Design an enzyme around this catalytic site. Sequence first.
Site, mmCIF file in Angstrom:
data_model
loop_
_atom_site.group_PDB
_atom_site.id
_atom_site.type_symbol
_atom_site.label_atom_id
_atom_site.label_comp_id
_atom_site.label_asym_id
_atom_site.label_seq_id
_atom_site.Cartn_x
_atom_site.Cartn_y
_atom_site.Cartn_z
ATOM 1 N N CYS A 66 -15.042 65.198 52.994
ATOM 2 C CA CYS A 66 -15.341 63.902 52.396
ATOM 3 C C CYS A 66 -14.278 62.871 52.765
ATOM 4 O O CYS A 66 -13.082 63.161 52.736
ATOM 5 C CB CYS A 66 -15.436 64.029 50.874
ATOM 6 S SG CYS A 66 -16.018 62.533 50.043
ATOM 7 N N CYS A 72 -12.527 60.976 49.591
ATOM 8 C CA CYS A 72 -11.512 61.836 48.995
ATOM 9 C C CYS A 72 -10.174 61.662 49.704
ATOM 10 O O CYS A 72 -9.114 61.782 49.091
ATOM 11 C CB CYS A 72 -11.952 63.299 49.059
ATOM 12 S SG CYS A 72 -13.345 63.699 47.978
#
Length: 121
Positions: free
Chosen positions: A37, A40
Amino acid sequence: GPLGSEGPVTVVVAKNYNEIVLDDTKDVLIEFYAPWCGHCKALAPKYEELGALYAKSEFKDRVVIAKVDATANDVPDEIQGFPTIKLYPAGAKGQPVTYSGSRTVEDLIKFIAENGKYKAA
């Protein structure tokens, strides 16, 4: 000295996920994220900073901020995605807060001390 970085935040794996989050005698801060991700990644340096910040400066022996991945581990708690931030209040083993999306660091810190029973801040 030579090596100041590496291992900045606390590590929480299925092997010690329970023993940690369970520790009600201290303030716990678990953050879930994915290694793939992107969103993130941005939260990586932020959560990592505040983590070691109090983890050793203020609540060196009172707070524990670790980050786990949704790839493979305990993570008994369910998640919609990952970019999750839960706080376990010391003494209250049943009142974990759930962030609806990290906007800034000042908010994440004020939250740990606001929702946290030990006021880790």
